[PDB]
Design an enzyme around this catalytic site. Sequence first.
Site, short mmCIF file in Angstrom:
data_model
loop_
_atom_site.label_atom_id
_atom_site.label_comp_id
_atom_site.label_asym_id
_atom_site.label_seq_id
_atom_site.Cartn_x
_atom_site.Cartn_y
_atom_site.Cartn_z
N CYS D 29 0.54 -1.24 0.18
CA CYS D 29 -0.05 -0.04 0.15
C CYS D 29 0.79 1.29 0.06
O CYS D 29 2.03 1.21 0.18
CB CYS D 29 -1.04 0.04 1.28
SG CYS D 29 -2.42 -1.02 1.04
N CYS D 32 -3.05 5.43 0.81
CA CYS D 32 -4.06 4.80 1.48
C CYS D 32 -4.38 3.67 0.98
O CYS D 32 -3.53 2.74 0.34
CB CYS D 32 -5.41 5.56 1.15
SG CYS D 32 -5.41 7.39 1.53
#
Lengths: 96, 235, 187, 103, 598
Positions: D29, D32
């Site tokens: 990731c 977000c």
Amino acid sequence: KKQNEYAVTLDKLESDLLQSLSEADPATILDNTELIQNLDKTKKTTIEITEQQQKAKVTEAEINIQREHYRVVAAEGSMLYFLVISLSVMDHMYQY
Amino acid sequence: NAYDTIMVYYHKLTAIEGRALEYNNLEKLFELQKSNYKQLKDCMNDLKNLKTMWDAIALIHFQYNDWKTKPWRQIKADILLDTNKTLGTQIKNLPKEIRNFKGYNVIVEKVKNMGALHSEFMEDRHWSQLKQITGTVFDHNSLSFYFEDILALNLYKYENTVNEIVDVAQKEAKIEKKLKNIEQWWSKQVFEFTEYKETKTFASLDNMMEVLDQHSLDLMGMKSQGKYVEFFYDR
Amino acid sequence: NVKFLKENIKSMIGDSLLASAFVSYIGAFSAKLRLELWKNTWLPDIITEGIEPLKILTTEAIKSKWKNEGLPADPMSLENAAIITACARWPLIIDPQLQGSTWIRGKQGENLTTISLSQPKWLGALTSSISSGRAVLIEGIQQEIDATLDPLLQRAVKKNGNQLQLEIGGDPIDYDPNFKLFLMTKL
Amino acid sequence: YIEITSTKQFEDILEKNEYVLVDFFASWCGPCKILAEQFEPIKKDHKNLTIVKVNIDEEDLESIVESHNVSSLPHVFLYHKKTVVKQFIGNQKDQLWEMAKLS
Amino acid sequence: HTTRLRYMIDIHLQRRKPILFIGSAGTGKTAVVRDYLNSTRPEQVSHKTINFSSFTDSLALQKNIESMVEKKNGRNYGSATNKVLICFIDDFNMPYVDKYGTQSPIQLLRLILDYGSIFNREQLEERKFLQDLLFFGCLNQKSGSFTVDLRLQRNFSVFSMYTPSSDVIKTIFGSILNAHLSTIDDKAQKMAFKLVEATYFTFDKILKNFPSAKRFHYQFNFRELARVCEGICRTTPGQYSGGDQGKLVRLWAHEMKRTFEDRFIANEHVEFFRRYLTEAISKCIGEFPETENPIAEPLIFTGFVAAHTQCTIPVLKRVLDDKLEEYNEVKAQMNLVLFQQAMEHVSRICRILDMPGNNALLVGVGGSGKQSLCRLSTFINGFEIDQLVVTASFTINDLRNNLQEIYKKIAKPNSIARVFMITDSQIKEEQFLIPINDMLNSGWIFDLFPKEDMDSLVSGVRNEAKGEGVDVNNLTALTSYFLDKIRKNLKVVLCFSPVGDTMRIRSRKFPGIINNTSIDWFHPWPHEALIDVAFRFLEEQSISLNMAKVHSSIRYNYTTPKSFLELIDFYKKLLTEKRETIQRQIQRYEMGLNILAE
């Protein structure tokens, strides 16, 4: 052996030529009296090399006059020796 | 702060690109020398873009950051070949504007800066060598794991110090193996006695003598070339 | 003297290639072979010629010191005294009679040793020699080459930390830049 | 969802299919959460669109990355009739949905 | 002839009778065995085949035999759910003969045939038997493969043949040509067949002159010509530009030179062959299609789309410089010049690597880094590389541990193998040559990976094989496919010195060397390349001619080409240091003038 050492004596002049600018590091060289004497030393060697050339000419010319006196029997005894040294190959025990 | 200035002048360049597009229309209306003028679309392509590559840098750099968080065991700077400067080379391959924007170019300067050490060959002495040679004052490499230490030290510019430490360690490698033999193969051995007319007496001398002489040969071959002698010098 | 040199740079081209090829190659061919090589010294391609490379090699002074060390006054010994100046690859001293070795030994009278092939302390004297930074002579070659000295016969100078050291046998032994080696064969 | 690692196969997908929504994505990731959990729904809702997932981390796939100049890991592209129609980045559900809706 | 073969083999299999055959190695006899076996297997009866070395005795026979089954009458063989068991002998005269000319496998066969029995060699009455086994094999003539003693052939029926005919060669290989050329742009069938008859004519005359007595590496073989026709069908099949037959003719002459100029020793051989080749091409078709091809070569890189088919000289220069720099990026550089023969050698490595399964040879001295050129070429190939480490503990166990590691890193990742390098020096224990021959032929070794190792190795390769589409039920197509993939992955290069007399000794001591690999000559240095390096190193023309002319003159009594490399280095030094000494004395004279003037 004397013309030998004298040609090596020139190497010291070659050194003292090199240091003339090297030992002083190219600085304050003008007021240094030691270089003047180094120049005078180079003059001594110049006639010392002149002594080397005359001796080389007079002696070695005479040396060859002395050397030729027997040279032919030398080269004779030279190859005569190599020949008798080669005898051992055709028969054992034939070594001198 | 640079962005805002570049945004104002890029909006002026957007008026520029509008006018250049209308002049392109004018060549479509009447023949002219469009190829004569070097009109580039890199500018307006970056106008539509540059968030693309900014987030690119966000991912390269938040890998740097997740990595700045990776604990001293979780970090991989030397068992990792080159993620940092691989992605930096990607940025350099990206268009001229991008490699020159110092978002991309701040992270590319960081890439050239940052751009084995966690293997068995490494030891506490190699960690301390890293400390001393890298000039880093940290209880970090010499302690039991490495994070956020030799990135604070530039990994690429002082990649050579790390490299020579790797080299001396892979040279030490042979002492990691060959002098374990003496201690294992000696500790698992005992004097052996046998009765010679009511007297127990040492026997099977051949195995013990080979044991002792192989021990000595290891000691010789170790006190030899490698300066690593200190790993088992006392032994 | 400056004038002599300002020409000498230009005179250095051509004749120098000739001395280099001969000294690297012809050091053991017959003398008569070397002669025709000098008359066939690629004359129309080497474009001074009265500057024969026998004198550019050394001076009378160095030959002179070696005479005091026992060097012959003889031409073939003179070119052999010139080839020993080249020490890129170790020499093969074909010595059908001894004075060649005697003068070389007379010329090497400081730090030195001598080991035969069938020698009990052969590897130990090898190790002591390379570690001490000295000379070493080998005479009873038996006209053969050993395998364990082949890493030493070639310049297998591997990096071992700051030190340079070489494998001769099981024991990996330290070099010494002061160390040199020579051999000698007869037939 | 289509998950492909080879540039040639991506090209043939574009030759043979009318509309393709490609999501360059990572196995990690960024700022977000992943859109991979909202991305499969859009494929399941629009079968007329070839929805492709493409993972930059793969060394074989670095070729697709270089070819499409993709630099941001999260990068959704809309192609129609072999040509790039639109491209946006960031795990942005609204942008992905708008792209799918206007595909 | 193979129709007669079929007629014989059918009834012999029905009779369960063991037979043999006499025939030259490289005459596709192994391939005939493969054809027959894969045609007849069909879950009716199992099979096995075994290779030999000189250092093979009854021992390995008992082991590789005794692999599997426990039936009655002690541990012995039983066709559970099958009929019999069969084994094949690849090479017959291979095992070592004592000074009386006997082989312990022959006496083991005495025992097994006359009694159907065996005695396990551990000290006991462990004396086992045999129930179902059939023996087969083949062998070339007496040279240098020994004669059979009458105690053997009385129990084994054989028959003879001889070299195939021109009509047979045309039949098979022109049928392959029909296939390949009729696939794409068939409008050149006549000229292609006529090209093939030109092949046969040139072959006939070069073998008429040049005999295999000239050197040990002289041999012409059916499988060589099969490799030739396979290099012909390798060509970019599309090549839809049929605009000149000269295109395929120049390509074909490129494969001709690939086949023969690597092998030729006397440049007189190359003269003869080029003369005959252009003579044939002229008696055949075309005006100056192949009259000169010094540079023409179908390469791979930068030819296909985005490759990075034939191309040109400056493109080759730029691409090779770029790949060298990319290699220097990650790996330590090696800046031996990209001279035309170095680039030709790189392309030779390229095509050798293009050929999978089999390997090749490199008979050339070191000095220049041939292994470093292998590093560069395998880097641009982008494949895995490895090389064994030499230690004082140069034990077969150490090679075996490295080899287990090799098989793990080849089977579990399911990728290309590590291309291997070996030199004559690297292999001191001569026993190391046998497992290498097993690598050459089978690519794996019995009992180096026992049964549990077999299962553990093929665990994941099985599931991936079900992914590609081989059923789990066969369980033999599976393992054959796995070892086939291992062969498709493995590549090895063997360096030698041509001066080595024992190169011929070990070539006769191992048939896999000469049969598997390809003969290339590494050959007096290219004089043009010497000129190139000479005038390049001016960075640090008549002189560049001159030193090579010197070397070209020294040849009369004795000379050494390698010392010319060390002489290039020696005179490069001498130039540097002589110019430096010139400078030193310039400064000494300058300062003499300074003090004079002052």
